[PDB]
RNA sequence: AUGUACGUCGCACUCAAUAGUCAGUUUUCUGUUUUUUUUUUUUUUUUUUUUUU
């Protein structure tokens, strides 16, 4: 969000979204705007939120996955590439209003 | 009582100077004084995720 604000995009605003977000700030994403808004989201909009007004989705193919191993004896959360169904779930969250373009920031064979 | 005896001598200092043996290629570094202090104690820094009589 700092990097998108530094470019100073014309007629565009940047919005965050996560589980720790304020309820007023969570609902502010749901309220309308003028022009184009860019929403930076986490796995909250993956599962339960179903944020509306989304045309194009950008997928890094990278998320954090909570784990717990016998060696660790500790809930470790390493950064890992996502699954196929989760990536295919990232395809469907922009085809809500009309036809959208999904961009995945990795290789097809990956 | 008488007569009775006398003469010459030596010594010192010395003593110099002698055989043969020719030659060794060209070039080179190495070199000087000056500011001097070599060392000054450190810090807390980020967030998949989601459900319970």
Reduce the DSSP state of residue A36 to 3 states and report it.
Answer: strand
Task: Name A78's Cβ contacts closer than 8 Å, sequence gap at least 6.
Answer: A64, A65, A67
Chain centroid to Cα A80, Å, comes to 15
Burial of A82 (0-12, 13-18, 19+ CB in 10 A): buried
Instruction: Check: CB of residue A13 under 8 Å from CB of residue A39.
Output: no
Identify which of A8, A48, A14 has the alpha carbon closest to the alpha carbon of residue A33. A14
Parallel/antiparallel/unpaired status of strands A75-76 and A12-16:
unpaired
To which H or E segment does residue A37 belong?
strand A36-40
CA–CA gap between residue A70 and residue A66 (Å, rounded): 14
Interatomic separation, CA of residue A40 and C1' of nucleotide B30, rounded (Å): 77
What number of other Cβ atoms are within 10 A of residue A25's Cβ?
A: 13
Closest nucleotide to A66's CA, by C1' atom? B48
Q: How far is the CA of A20 from the C1' of B23 (A)?
A: 109
Residues A14 and A33 sit within 8 Å (Cβ to Cβ):
no
Place of tokens 């007004």: A53
**Angle at alpha carbon of residue A3, lines to A38 and A24, rounded to 5°:** 45
Q: Is A57 exposed, middle or buried (0-12, 13-18, 19+ CB in 10 A)?
A: buried
Q: Closest nucleotide to A82's CA, by C1' atom? A: B48
Q: Resolution limit in angstroms? A: 3.1
């Amino acid at each position: 969000a700092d990097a998108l604000n530094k470019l100073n995009l014309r007629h565009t605003e940047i919005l965050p979204l996560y589980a720790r977000l304020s309820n007023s700030e969570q609902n502010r994403v749901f309220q309308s705007h003028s022009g184009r808004r860019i929403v930076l989201a986490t796995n909250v909009a993956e599962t339960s939120l179903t944020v509306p007004g989304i045309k194009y989705v950008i997928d890094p193919g990278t998320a954090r996955i909570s784990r717990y191993s016998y060696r660790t004896k500790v809930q470790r959360l390493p950064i890992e590439p996502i699954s196929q169904a989760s990536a295919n779930q990232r395809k469907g969250r922009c085809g809500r209003v009309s036809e959208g373009i999904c961009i995945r920031l990795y290789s097809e064979d990956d």
